[PDB]
Amino acid sequence: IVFDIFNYIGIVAFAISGAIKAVKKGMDLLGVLVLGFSTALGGGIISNLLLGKTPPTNLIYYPYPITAFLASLATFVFYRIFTNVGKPLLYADAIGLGAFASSGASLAYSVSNNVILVVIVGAITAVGGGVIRDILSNEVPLILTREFYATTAVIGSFVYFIASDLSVPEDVALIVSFLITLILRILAMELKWE
Amino acid sequence: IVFDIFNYIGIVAFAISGAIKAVKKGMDLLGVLVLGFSTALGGGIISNLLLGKTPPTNLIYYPYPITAFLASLATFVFYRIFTNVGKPLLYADAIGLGAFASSGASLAYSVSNNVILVVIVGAITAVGGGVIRDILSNEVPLILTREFYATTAVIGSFVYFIASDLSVPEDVALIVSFLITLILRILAMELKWE
Amino acid sequence: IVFDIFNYIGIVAFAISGAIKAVKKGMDLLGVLVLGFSTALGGGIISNLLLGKTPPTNLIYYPYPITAFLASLATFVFYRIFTNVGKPLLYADAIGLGAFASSGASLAYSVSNNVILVVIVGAITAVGGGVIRDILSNEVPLILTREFYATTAVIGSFVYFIASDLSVPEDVALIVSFLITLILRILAMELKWE
Ligand code: NA
Ligand code: NA
């Protein structure tokens, strides 16, 4: 059940991050929806393609794109009203990074217990939405500008792999991977490691 | 037969748009061919990947890439001679948007009657070539800069789905989806909605 | 055995090119690793997706990503020490272009003897890593800025196809395709064709 919850958490968090980016770039409602939608679902779609899972879950399981839409719309309405309140793009991205590094590693592990597949596909699941967000926004992505960003995704997917290898129950393994990924991002941002 | 015709119309229209972009960015013959080729075939390739259709039709069915090549070459020669005549990049893109939103939704519908799959894959088929064109050109894509652009693709794929759901013959369903997509773009551009 | 060697040559060469790009853009160790890793393995991953080969070889065959990592790390250490020695990004890219145009055409040919599939997938394998490198770096890719770049990849994959069609042994066919691709790039760069 933790797996199902993490999919929704990551979709909402990445939708908020993509919608925030759109608002900061001056876009209006429909363009904000496009960037939130793409950021929220891109990581899962890329991950499914790499694992040969077609059609991708994000394009068939109705609650996922509906959630991406509604979270992006809520973000637009929020900042259309409250134009001068802070825009935590990086914290929204970091929560999504933990939710998808853990859930993305879990999906890769179900295909094969190859550590390279699990760690790299999990990390691609985690950063993929934000990479799409940043490329569509015509700027250098966070995976290059933030020194510890992509490696923290790699670490979070690796701790999922290790926990699963050590027979840790899937719910616990997802939670621990999420926690380490998010804590490492919080430390990077709050301690000015980047 | 409308399906087969729309594939050629969209390939030519998107090749012209990518070749025009290349000419406006100062590229020469071979670079113009690369951008026209990529714009014309990218949407179909991405769509095939999302539906698990490999190898993609655009890389096996000879008339499609030959058409992409010849339309891109014709565009280069035209503007090499007539340097000062108008460059209708957006109208070429809009005709392709209608041809591929309709044909791309048709392909997705043949895989499954899931409305989310049909609408989103159809829209990705429609905008994908231009997104590739704009990313390769190092600028923000039309799906973000034009407020009604991506939503009009979504609308056109949705009207295909509705028409097919209502048992409208495939030729008519493709034509109506094409028409609505193109008319909505014409209205957006001519009435300064964006 | 030439096929296996070319995979390592192209991975090392593209890793060096992506790591050099990262160093020139001011990134530190971990960001240099991310760009080298992505450049070295991206072409193979895209090529596998187009041919329906999942999971991609670069994410399961341990020596490939290990080689990408080690070559990127060696490049960072080299230029961290020797900051003022030349940075042959384009020569590293050109060696990879020949190694992957040949090996990528070979992989496509094993799926089908369709000349369009072999030539275009082979060329996408050859340029894909550098296109990813350039998009992540927020600039126009070499396939658009260098007039003879993408066409030379197309030529190299085509000479592989012709040699294989003429029953030339695979080792020789790979070597000849590699040679023509690399020689054509050397001529383009040394004779100021671009
Ligand atoms: Na840019
Ligand atoms: Na860019």
Side-chain angles (χ1 to χ4, degrees), chain B residues 47-104:
Chain B
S47 93
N48 283 184
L49 293 182
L50 291 173
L51 301 179
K53 286 151 147 35
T54 60
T57 303
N58 282 345
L59 301 188
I60 48 185
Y61 189 63
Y62 304 100
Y64 288 176
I66 283 177
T67 292
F69 173 82
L70 293 178
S72 298
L73 177 60
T75 304
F76 169 81
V77 175
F78 179 83
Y79 285 108
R80 174 79 172 81
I81 299 172
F82 300 113
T83 61
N84 282 47
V85 311
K87 282 141 193 84
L89 192 151
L90 291 168
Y91 274 85
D93 181 282
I95 290 162
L97 197 75
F100 281 180
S102 52
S103 80

Side-chain angles (χ1 to χ4, degrees), chain A residues 134-135 137-140, chain B residues 134-135 137-140, chain C residues 134-135 137-140:
Chain A
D134 296 337
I135 293 170
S137 305
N138 192 29
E139 82 179 71
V140 181
Chain B
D134 296 337
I135 293 170
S137 305
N138 192 29
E139 82 179 71
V140 181
Chain C
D134 296 337
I135 293 170
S137 305
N138 192 29
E139 82 179 71
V140 181

